[PDB]
Amino acid sequence: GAPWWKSAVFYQVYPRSFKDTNGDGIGDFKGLTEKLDYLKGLGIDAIWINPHYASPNTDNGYDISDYREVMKEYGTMEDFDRLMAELKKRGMRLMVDVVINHSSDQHEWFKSSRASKDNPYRDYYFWRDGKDGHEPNNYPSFFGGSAWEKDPVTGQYYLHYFGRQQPDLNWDTPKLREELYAMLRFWLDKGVSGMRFATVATYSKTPGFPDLTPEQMKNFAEAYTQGPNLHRYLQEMHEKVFDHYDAVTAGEIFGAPLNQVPLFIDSRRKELDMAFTFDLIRYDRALDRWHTIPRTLADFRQTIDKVDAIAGEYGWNTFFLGNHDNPRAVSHFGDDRPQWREASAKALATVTLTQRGTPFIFQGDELGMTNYPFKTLQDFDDIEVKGFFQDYVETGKATAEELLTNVALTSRDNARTPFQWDDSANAGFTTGKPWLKVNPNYTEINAAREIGDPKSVYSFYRNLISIRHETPALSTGSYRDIDPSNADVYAYTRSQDGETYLVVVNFKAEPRSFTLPDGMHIAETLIESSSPAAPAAGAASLELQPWQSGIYKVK
Ligand SMILES: OC[C@H]1O[C@@H](O)[C@H](O)[C@@H](O)[C@@H]1O
Ligand SMILES: [Ca+2]
DSSP: OOOGGGGOOEEEEOGGGTOOSSSSSSOOHHHHHHTHHHHHHHTOOEEEEOOOEEOOOTTTTSSOSEEEEEOGGGOOHHHHHHHHHHHHHTTOEEEEEEOOSBOOTTSHHHHHHTTOTTSTTGGGBOEEOOBTTBOSSOOBOTTSSBSEEEOTTTSOEEEOSSOTTSOBBOTTOHHHHHHHHHHHHHHHTTTOOEEEETTGGGSSOOTTOOOOOHHHHHTHHHHTTOOTTHHHHHHHHHHHTGGGSOOEEEEEOTTOOGGGTHHHHOGGGOSOSEEEOOTTTTTTBOTTSSSBOOOOHHHHHHHHHHHHHHTTTTOOBEEOSOOTTSOOHHHHTSOOSTTTHHHHHHHHHHHHTTSSSEEEEETTGGGTOOOOOOOSGGGOOOHHHHHHIIIIITTTSSOHHHHHHHHHHHOGGGGOSOOOOSSSGGGGSOSSOOSSOOOGGGGTSOHHHHHTOTTSHHHHHHHHHHHHHHOTHHHHSEEEESOTTOSSEEEEEEEETTEEEEEEEEOSSSOEEEEOOTTOOEEEEEEEESOSSOOOTTOSEEEEOTTOEEEEEEO
16 A cells, blocks of 8 residues: 555645734734635645744744744744644644754754853854864855854854854764754654655765865755765664654755665665655756756656656655745746736646646645746845845846846745735735735735636646546556657656556647557546647547646546
């Protein structure tokens, strides 16, 4: 048999932007709880929530100052326990975000660590003498400037791959790893069903902190995933924690070459259960992470093909076209112009729900939400954009307008604008002023408008989730790309126990044709989007409308 997580459909909730119930403009636990009937109705089996722990929010939850307290903004431990209970009444499961590559610089461990070199917490972090009058080495940070920050209290620099207020935790220190395992046990003892591990591939650092080479410097994210003790630490965490619970684990494998992914997910290695990879979501992103390189569907499917292959026989992949760190799915992979937004959003839904692996739908994508129309750099909240400003504008490599032009298409903030519930003030997200502006298209794009409409993007996701739930080959069946070279129509099969399904999606806003492979004919049409008529039983070919998608049982 296959674990519940292999045939589950997950929904990712970014609490901060899902539903606010007290008018401070920030979503909270009570709002999410209020909306569980909505997600149950869509057909969601489990929810992954972004960090919900006490945090100064320099990186919206990913800078944790106390791993055993809930974030003040989201509510209390009681609201969290109530979220858990309400999910359970509905047979739903909760996956929480685990951030243990680093903590906030307000965590008590860090306040202690920085006091002196002999403090019992000194080695919970990485402290090192500067070199040749400057930092310990040339490591850059993802959020700007050096990954090393000098602390006058002792004269040494501490390590921070991410923000200056997100010091990296030292996994080479046994006592620190034991503190981390105990923390995990605290949440797992509360009944949590899954854990998503933030930047799980950077836990291990390189002994000696040598300078990155010129080449390594072009893609430093990759070098940070090459620590020598990485799998040893993940195997220990598994042996000491996960082997005693029934929780599914999912690693955010940020920066690692795809060839290394199996080391994290091969069930026999006893590390993680499934992977979140970045090969597809960043397939058209330049190395500097704020420019886009044009790509075709051929690149899209070939990437998916390579990723599916890495899961081999004992690994498992998650599948997603969107999350809180990337531009909106329909805007990024589809066509968000008014005339094609709904049609392309439905096509992308068909792709997402028929991929081999566990699908994660990001809040709002089921409604066809789009990127946001940023007008000035001041319209972004993201610390990452401030880091691009520091690294490229202040340095004269680019102008503020160039940064604006490009980052509008790639910013994480595109996925963080308030969820569009209805067409009331601020789309019903809040009675106050939203922490991030609501997209003006909320008047045409909102859940209340779509839930009662048989033809809406929402209803289409809902029917796809039902179809996937009733069709085993669609979750655990094999996957085969029919033609990796085709840049027009994405076609593939899913098979299991003699049943084979065909998925065909036109990625062009023009009619196209698709001829089934020799000896294959349509048997039944499960569903189609943007189609005036289902093909006839026995069809050897398909005529497709712009952005048409469909799932068919073949014979
Ligand atoms: O904490 C650093 C980063 O970790 C990633 O796992 C999260 O998805 C990002 O949102 C965050 O900025
Ligand atoms: Ca609130």
